[PDB]
Amino acid sequence: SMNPPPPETSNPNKPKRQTNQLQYLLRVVLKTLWKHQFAWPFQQPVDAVKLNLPDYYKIIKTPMDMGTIKKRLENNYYWNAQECIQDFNTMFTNCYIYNKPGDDIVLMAEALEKLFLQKINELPT
Ligand SMILES: Cc1cc(NNc2ccc(C(=O)Nc3ccccc3N)cc2)c(N)cc1O
């Protein structure tokens, strides 16, 4: 189809390891963004067929979304917090580079990113 397989969310051979930063990323950062009124366009992978988004996957090489991030955190997929932070950054970058400035989707992304950056500024050491 026009859509790729969704990003992997589990690593069956990675040992389980918790960090307080990963706990914060799930229980504070992801939870806060997930419950925000503007979360809905970002809660699942972009479906370029259903959304009629021409060339989305020609332009966006590394799709990412908060449903994938949520599952990765729940499944202890990330070895470290910085991998998770990178996924959030990629999600926002994809939106800003594909869509036109001032499209509603971009303004929603910016509100979520502002909240994200606020919480990251309090990331535990
Ligand atoms: C990251 C990113 C996302 C998107 N849109 N994502 C969407 C758009 C719409 C919906 C929706 O459910 N609408 C909806 C709202 C109310 C009643 C029923 C329905 N169906 C879900 C996701 C675009 N375009 C560009 C983009 O870069």
UniProtKB/Swiss-Prot annotation:
Record-annotated site: Acetylated histone binding: N99
Effect after changing D104G: Found in a patient with a neurodevelopmental syndrome; uncertain significance
Residue intervals of the Bromo domain: 17-123
Documented effect of changing N99A: Abolishes binding to acetylated histones
Protein localization: Nucleus; Chromosome
Family named by the database record: Belongs to the BET family.
Function of the protein: Chromatin reader protein that recognizes and binds acetylated histones and plays a key role in transmission of epigenetic memory across cell divisions and transcription regulation. Remains associated with acetylated chromatin throughout the entire cell cycle and provides epigenetic memory for postmitotic G1 gene transcription by preserving acetylated chromatin status and maintaining high-order chromatin structure. During interphase, plays a key role in regulating the transcription of signal-inducible genes by associating with the P-TEFb complex and recruiting it to promoters.
Recorded domain comment: The NET domain mediates interaction with a number of chromatin proteins involved in transcription regulation (NSD3, JMJD6, CHD4, GLTSCR1 and ATAD5). The C-terminal (CTD) region mediates interaction and recruitment of CDK9 and CCNT1 subunits of the P-TEFb complex. It is also required for maintenance of higher-order chromatin structure.
Additional note from the record: JQ1, a thieno-triazolo-1,4-diazepine derivative, and I-BET, a benzodiazepine derivative, have been tested on tumors with success. Treatment with GSK1210151A (I-BET151, a I-BET derivative) has strong effets on mixed lineage leukemia and promotes myeloid differentiation and leukemia stem-cell depletion.
Disease link: Cornelia de Lange syndrome 6: A form of Cornelia de Lange syndrome, a clinically heterogeneous developmental disorder associated with malformations affecting multiple systems. It is characterized by facial dysmorphisms, abnormal hands and feet, growth delay, cognitive retardation, hirsutism, gastroesophageal dysfunction and cardiac, ophthalmologic and genitourinary anomalies. CDLS6 inheritance is autosomal dominant. A chromosomal aberration involving BRD4 is found in a rare, aggressive, and lethal carcinoma arising in midline organs of young people. Translocation t(15;19)(q14;p13) with NUTM1 which produces a BRD4-NUTM1 fusion protein.
Full protein name: Bromodomain-containing protein 4
Taxonomic classification: Eukaryota, Metazoa, Chordata, Craniata, Vertebrata
Gene: BRD4
